[PDB]
Write a protein that binds this ligand. Structure first.
Ligand SMILES: C[C@H](NC[C@H](O)CP(=O)(O)CC1CCCCC1)c1ccc(Cl)c(Cl)c1
Ligand SMILES: *[C@@H]1O[C@H](CO)[C@@H](O)[C@H](O)[C@H]1NC(C)=O
Ligand SMILES: *[C@@H]1O[C@H](CO)[C@@H](O)[C@H](O)[C@H]1NC(C)=O
Ligand SMILES: *[C@@H]1O[C@H](CO)[C@@H](O)[C@H](O)[C@H]1NC(C)=O
Ligand SMILES: *[C@@H]1O[C@H](CO)[C@@H](O)[C@H](O)[C@H]1NC(C)=O
Ligand SMILES: *[C@@H]1O[C@H](CO)[C@@H](O)[C@H](O)[C@H]1NC(C)=O
Ligand SMILES: *[C@@H]1O[C@H](CO)[C@@H](O)[C@H](O)[C@H]1NC(C)=O
Ligand SMILES: *[C@@H]1O[C@H](CO)[C@@H](O)[C@H](O)[C@H]1NC(C)=O
Ligand SMILES: *[C@@H]1O[C@H](CO)[C@@H](O)[C@H](O)[C@H]1NC(C)=O
Lengths: 685, 670
């Protein structure tokens, strides 16, 4: 009432420049001081007053005005700078004058350094408050690798270097980082090249209206890409005329549909009373009565609640400190400043801007409104509070495919199998063939003493039929694959089929070649043991060859992949086929020598069978038909041995050729070698 | 005497590191002040420098500037500021009090922006004033491929960006850029990887020892690499604790670039003295304090102040920081200063000093001056005697490679050609012997046309070797490309006749044992081979191809490598043609060998040469398969493979003709 000893606040309100906040944060401060002076509850003995200067957001002028504030008549108790560069200057200087600095409009991360600015506070949150929100979405939608294109302003660099540490605590990875000055052609082209899905674009509006024209040109938008921008652009920043870009307004709307934006909630979205008995709607209505222009064309309108709440936080701190006297403050005592600092630190109240609490670094904690551009108009899809970690979703995120896209395209490794129909058909033919083989072997062994089938070497044809049966039995495991066997039992199946087919062919063609060979060598100038020992030595050398193969270079499973094909069950899925073989390190070199050895024996057999065509001998009387058996076996083997290699891929045709050659060789061999030798014994004796 | 007051903001304390600058330049300021006082340049007035202590802290510096504005006399200018943050804070605000600042130790490029700092001047060259000097040193030694190894701090980033900006428009290109942060030895995969010889470094002292240690660990030092780094490191900076014995070895001959403290000339300066007299009297005043490399710039700064105040007086006092026109007058009076001081010609271009840049080079214990650049005249000069290179000539920007076609040894070719011509005249002598004794009954016991075809095939196999042997450096290019076809025509025709005749004889002997047209078979064999060869020429003619080896070996060492390349005659898919013809020949050869073994002990009076033709088939078989295997296996060195193929062909044909014709001469003549 009477004492009313005034307490002075020095303030710098930018009425022009990069951010004309003082055009609306200064009226909001004035009004606020009234509510602190008209209420007898807070600071009744004292009265808060305001000396202010126009800073224009130029530190060069703020330096002169800081001289005017600190070196003129009334002693200030606190400083209230606006934008961020002035705030950096003033907050570094005021350490020497023992002053508190309480900014209302600075968003730089750099100001959260408690070593440079040991007495700085602000009701405007740091720009890094967006980062806890973004991560919360990346964990909600499961994305785990991210691209970050930015403009090279220091605020954006500090924001992204905080985002890196914020994600690497959660396991997410930033795979790509690009920085540009004014023209983003190269960064966005490298993003299209590297195939980045989730993008975080940190740049101003004029840079954005160029980035997104180059995104429409490069087609980096659409159904599989999502853009995370900043929320404080104008709500029609993509529809205004701009000659620096080349994409009509009908485009540049299509490149932006569906991008998420985070902003700070400056005003309270409820309709409750603050610590000044006033709601957000009527605070806005009351401030609009002061401004001499419309709030659409006045600057700093979206920040006036922060100036109001800074005035109120200061008032409540002064009301909590004061039996400390504020009328005897001078720039050399550091105790009264410590009192005001400890009362300002532990600040918690409800203002027009919401709940007002400061960090350990003096930055205010606030809410983040998350919204999404849907059809050319932003729609609020949620809120998030980082302090108690509460995300309030509204269930309005209209995605293009129903579900949000993924961080990268998945590849499904599909195995290929031969069609089971053809396998089972050839297997049943081979089973009837092997039962015919054992029938013919039993027939030959029954009549051992007829002396007409003793003039034909009987044991040699028995060994031929046994080898034929072993080849027909080895057709079976040749068709088996990963459809039935599995990984652990694979090498046993391949090794078994190798040994069975090798021994079958060796024994059959050895028993047929020793007969042709000895008929020729007796014709040109007879004994059972020599005849048996020759085929025994032949199959023994082949057995030793296959054993050295096994021992020096075992056969093992090997997968070979194909070119990627679009499988189309989903619009965005990609699958790569795989074929499973049994192979050694150098199977082709090792198999080639064996195939050549057998081919040379087969051609030698053909020549010997044609040379000894009409010769007649009584100790072996069936060479005339053994020759035509050899001709067919050799023709089939020397033509389906290379085809099994040229068609190593297309496993169905490889199996078809190989197994049809085996079964037809077996059938014609046993027929032309045993049908006459039984027909002459059921029609002539 | 009415004073003219000047504000001198410097760190003068004992604990601040840069205080040594503010304590080493004060002798020079005292010299300049006392000499302006004795000379009476400013006759009615007198110059008074008030010294204030900005401890290189933004807060203390701004408080000192404020306490000078309030509790101090009427200042007309500001003099000094050695730390960049405080100097920036004050330089941006000068325009509010109309004060003009002249610095002498603030070298940061930032202050060159004359939109933020239109009232700032400095007598010391900027940090990015060394870039034109580097450009002149490069255009002076023809270096055009340069690799930059910067560091990711602000100052080095500005120097690097101005380097990028100044090499524009010139024929010097930057191949690669490295921007290491704290451990510089990851540039190995990039600097060496692109193989750059002229490295431009911009990094601070503590990283220079790590760079010159990683360069020794990688061997980026020696007669072939050049390092161009900043030269403002303290003397003996390489004492940071590869060993010192190897760190010095990797540092030998790096070129440091810095500003020149004192001009080397001997013209009488505006002070009436020469730079050497000033240096001597300064070191006489500099009794106990440390010598600071900035003293000449502070001397020239005080002289610029005095001349500017004089020139502003003669164009006209109560100054109170509110007078705009007087500050504008002093600004115009300082924009046209032009005189000679102890650091060279003092003249400003957009507030920046146009000074001289010193080039120095590390020589075996310490850095010695090897040249100087002059920016106002833009001329580089180099002291030829002082500069030295570890190589006999200055390093080159880019290593290049020379072809050096892989040749075959000419004397070995000559020796093998002499042996083959000896064998060819021997074969022609055997043919003449056979045609002479044609009607002798013993020669009639062997089909003579078959032996004459054998001898014709042997002489053609002896005549193909002259074409097959050629390296390709003895003949022209396109003539060579149309000669690899004749070599194979003659080789396959000679082989087909020389083998078909003895094959005909062995098959006929075998067929007549078990129980004219004998030459038709070789006619059909030559017909099928001619068809194969004409199809070969028709669908994919033998082309000319060339292959390259490691490019590594340098025997002479001209700093340029050699690219050993080898010639060949191939086509698109010649592997299938080689396989086809080799199989067609090898299966038939084996078949003939089998017929020769089955028909070994036979005796036929009509064809008496049955056994020795079989031995010839055996030797032809063995030698031909061995020759083909070695020819396909040892394509690496053409000398050894040519030698082996020549020896095997000559041996095969000579043994064949010996076994065929020699006994039918020894048993016939005697
Ligand atoms: C939400 C924020 N509030 C004020 C801001 O913290 C002031 P600041 O921290 O000083 C950064 C400014 C300065 C340069 C141009 C715009 C940004 C903001 C950010 C960008 C823009 Cl364009 C506006 Cl209008 C407001
Ligand atoms: C102001 O301080 C007084 C004294 O402690 C206290 O009673 C009053 O509640 C405070 N006012 C507010 C709004 O906190
Ligand atoms: C912009 O687009 C128009 C289309 O008519 C074209 O003529 C013009 O060259 C383009 N300019 C640029 C800079 O892309
Ligand atoms: C706040 O304003 C409402 C509106 O009339 C009033 O009812 C209420 O009493 C006020 N609360 C105060 C003054 O504490
Ligand atoms: C600062 O104010 C306090 C108030 O209690 C008082 O000690 C004195 O006026 C100042 N302190 C010092 C140490 O001078
Ligand atoms: C600031 O407030 C926090 C929260 O209560 C507290 O932990 C911290 O100690 C306070 N600072 C000081 C200097 O006491
Ligand atoms: C101008 O100078 C006079 C005398 O030096 C001084 O009294 C006056 O205050 C100055 N002007 C301003 C604006 O301070
Ligand atoms: C500064 O001086 C230069 C010549 O040294 C002159 O060309 C320039 O116009 C001057 N700047 C002015 C007058 O603003
Ligand atoms: C090399 O430098 C010396 C001394 O500066 C000079 O005399 C000589 O002419 C220079 N060489 C050439 C080729 O100019």
């Amino acid at each position: 009432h009477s004492e009313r000893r005034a307490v002075y606040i020095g303030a710098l309100f930018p009425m022009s420049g990069g951010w004309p906040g003082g055009q609306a944060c200064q009226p909001a401060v004035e009004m606020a001081l009234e509510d602190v002076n008209s209420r007898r509850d807070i600071l009744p003995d004292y009265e808060l007053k305001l000396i202010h200067h126009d800073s224009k957001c130029d530190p060069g002028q703020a330096t002169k005005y800081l001289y005017e504030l600190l070196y003129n008549d009334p002693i200030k108790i606190i400083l209230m700078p606006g934008c961020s560069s002035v705030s950096t200057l003033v907050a570094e200087a005021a350490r020497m004058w023992n002053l508190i600095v309480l900014s209302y409009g600075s968003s730089s991360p750099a100001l959260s350094n408690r070593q440079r600015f040991p007495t700085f506070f602000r009701t405007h949150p740091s720009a890094t408050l967006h980062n806890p929100t973004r991560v919360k979405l990346f964990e909600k939608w499961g994305w785990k690798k991210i691209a970050t294109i930015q403009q090279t302003t220091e605020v954006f660099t500090s924001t992204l270097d905080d985002l890196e540490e914020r994600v690497k605590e959660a396991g997410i990875e930033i795979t790509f980082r690009q920085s540009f000055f004014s023209d983003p052609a190269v960064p966005v082209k490298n993003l299209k090249r590297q195939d980045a899905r989730i993008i975080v674009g940190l740049f101003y509006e004029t840079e954005a209206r160029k980035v997104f024209c180059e995104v429409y040109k490069e087609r980096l938008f659409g159904k599989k890409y999502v853009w995370f921008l900043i929320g404080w652009y104008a709500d029609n920043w993509f529809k205004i005329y701009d000659p620096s870009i080349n994409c009509t307004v009908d485009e540049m709307t299509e490149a932006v549909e569906g991008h998420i934006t985070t902003e700070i909630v400056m005003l309270n979205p409820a309709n409750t009373r603050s610590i000044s008995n006033m709601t957000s709607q009527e605070f806005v209505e009351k401030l609009t009565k002061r401004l001499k222009r419309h709030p659409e064309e006045t600057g700093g309108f979206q920040e006036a609640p922060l100036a109001y709440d800074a005035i109120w936080a200061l008032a409540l701190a002064l009301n909590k400190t004061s039996g400390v006297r504020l009328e005897d403050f001078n720039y050399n005592n550091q105790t009264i400043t410590d009192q005001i600092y400890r009362a300002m630190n532990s600040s918690s109240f409800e203002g027009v801007s919401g709940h007002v609490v400061f960090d350990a670094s003096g930055s205010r904690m606030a809410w983040t409104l998350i919204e999404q551009l849907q059809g050319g108009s932003y729609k609020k899809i949620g809120y998030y509070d980082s302090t108690k970690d509460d995300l309030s979703w509204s269930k309005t995120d209209k995605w293009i495919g129903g579900s949000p896209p993924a961080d990268q395209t998945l590849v499904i490794k599909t195995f290929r199998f031969l069609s089971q129909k053809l396998f089972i058909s050839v297997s049943v033919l081979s089973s009837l063939g092997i039962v015919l083989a054992v029938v013919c072997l039993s027939f030959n062994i029954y009549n051992s003493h007829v002396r007409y089938i003793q003039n034909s070497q009987p044991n040699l044809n028995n060994l031929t039929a046994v080898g034929c049966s072993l080849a027909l039995a080895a057709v079976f495991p040749l068709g088996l694959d990963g459809y039935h066997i599995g990984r652990n039992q694979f090498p046993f199946v391949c090794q078994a089929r190798l040994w069975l087919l090798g021994l079958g062919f060796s024994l059959g063609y050895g028993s047929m070649f020793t007969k042709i060979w000895w008929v020729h060598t007796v014709f040109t100038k007879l004994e059972p043991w020599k005849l048996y020992a020759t085929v025994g030595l032949l199959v023994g050398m082949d057995v030793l060859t296959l054993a050295i193969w096994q021992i020096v270079d075992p056969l093992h499973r090997t997968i070979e992949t194909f070119a990627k094909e679009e499988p189309k069950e989903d619009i965005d899925v990609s699958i790569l086929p795989q074929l499973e073989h049994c192979s050694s390190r150098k199977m082709n070199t090792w198999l080639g020598i064996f195939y050549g050895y057998k081919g040379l024996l087969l051609l030698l057999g053909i020549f010997l069978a044609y040379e000894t065509k009409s010769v007649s001998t009584e100790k072996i009387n069936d060479h005339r038909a053994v020759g035509m058996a050899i001709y067919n076996v050799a023709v089939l083997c020397l033509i389906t041995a290379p085809v099994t290699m040229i068609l190593s891929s297309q496993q169905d045709a490889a199996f078809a050729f190989a197994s049809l050659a085996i079964v037809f060789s077996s059938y014609i061999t046993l027929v032309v070698l045993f049908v006459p030798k039984m027909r002459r014994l059921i029609t002539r004796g | 005497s009415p004073p003219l007051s000047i504000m001198g903001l410097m760190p003068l304390t004992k604990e601040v590191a840069k205080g040594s600058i503010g304590r080493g330049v004060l002798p020079a300021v005292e010299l300049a002040i006392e000499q302006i006082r004795n000379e009476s340049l400013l006759r009615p007035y007198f110059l008074d420098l008030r010294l204030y202590d900005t401890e290189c802290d933004n807060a203390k510096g701004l408080k000192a500037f404020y306490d000078a504005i309030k509790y101090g006399p009427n200042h007309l200018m500001v003099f000094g500021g050695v730390c960049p943050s405080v100097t920036s804070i004050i330089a941006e605000s000068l325009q509010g009090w109309n004060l003009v600042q002249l610095s002498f130790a603030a070298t940061t490029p930032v202050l060159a922006d004359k939109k933020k700092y239109p009232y700032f001047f400095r007598t010391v060259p900027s940090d990015n004033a060394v870039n034109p000097a580097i450009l002149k040193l490069l255009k002076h030694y023809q270096w055009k491929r340069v690799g930059t190894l910067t560091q990711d701090v602000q100052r080095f980033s500005e120097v690097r960006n101005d380097l990028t900006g100044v090499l524009y428009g010139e024929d010097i290109e930057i191949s690669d850029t490295e921007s290491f942060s704290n451990d510089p030895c990851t540039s190995v995969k990039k600097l060496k990887g692109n193989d750059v010889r002229i490295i431009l470094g911009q990094f601070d002292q503590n990283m220079a020892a790590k760079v010159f240690c990683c360069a020794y660990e990688e061997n980026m030092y020696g007669s072939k690499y050049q390092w161009i780094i900043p030269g403002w490191y303290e003397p003996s900076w390489w004492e940071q604790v590869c060993l010192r014995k190897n760190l010095l070895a990797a540092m030998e001959g790096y070129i440091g670039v810095d500003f020149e403290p004192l001009s080397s000339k001997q013209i009488k300066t505006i002070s009436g003295k020469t730079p050497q007299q000033y240096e001597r009297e300064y070191n006489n005043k500099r009794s106990g304090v440390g010598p600071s490399k900035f003293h000449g710039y502070a001397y020239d700064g005080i002289w610029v102040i005095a001349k500017t105040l004089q020139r502003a007086m003669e164009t006209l006092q109560d100054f109170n920081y509110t007078d705009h026109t007087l500050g504008r007058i002093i600004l115009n009076a300082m924009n046209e200063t032009n005189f000679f001081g102890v650091t060279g010609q003092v003249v400003f271009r957009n507030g920046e000093r146009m000074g001289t840049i010193k080039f120095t080079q590390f020589q075996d214990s310490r850095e010695v001056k090897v040249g100087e650049y002059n920016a106002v005249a833009d001329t580089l000069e180099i002291i030829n005697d002082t500069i030295r290179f570890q190589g006999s000539e200055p390093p080159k920007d880019k290593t290049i490679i020379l072809e050096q076609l892989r040749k075959i040894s000419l004397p070995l070719y000559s020796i093998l050609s002499a042996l083959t011509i000896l064998g060819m005249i021997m074969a022609s002598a055997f043919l003449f012997f056979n045609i002479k004794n044609r009607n002798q009954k013993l020669i009639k016991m062997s089909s003579p046309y078959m032996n004459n075809l054998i001898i014709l095939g042997g002489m053609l196999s002896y005549a193909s070797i002259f074409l097959f042997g050629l390296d390709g450096s003895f003949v022209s290019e396109k003539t060579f490309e149309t000669l690899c076809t004749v070599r194979t025509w003659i080789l396959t025709v000679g082989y087909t006749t020389a083998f078909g005749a003895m094959f005909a004889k062995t098959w006929r002997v075998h067929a007549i044992f078990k129980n004219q047209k004998l030459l038709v078979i070789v006619g059909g064999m030559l017909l099928i081979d001619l068809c194969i060869l004409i199809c070969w020429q028709a669908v994919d003619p033998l082309r000319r191809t060339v292959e390259k080896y490691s490019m590594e070996p340098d025997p002479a060492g001209r700093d340029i490598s050699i690219r050993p390349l080898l010639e060949h005659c191939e086509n698109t898919h010649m592997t299938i043609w080689l396989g086809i013809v080799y199989a067609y020949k090898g299966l038939l050869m084996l078949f003939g060998c089998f017929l020769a073994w089955e028909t070994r002990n036979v005796s036929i009076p009509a064809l008496n040469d049955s056994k020795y033709i079989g031995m010839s088939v055996y030797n032809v078989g063995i030698m031909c398969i061995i020759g083909a295997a070695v020819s396909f296996l040892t394509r690496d060195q053409p000398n050894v493979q040519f030698c082996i193929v020549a020896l095997v062909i000559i041996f095969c044909s000579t043994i064949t003709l010996c076994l065929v014709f020699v006994p039918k001469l020894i048993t016939l003549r005697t």
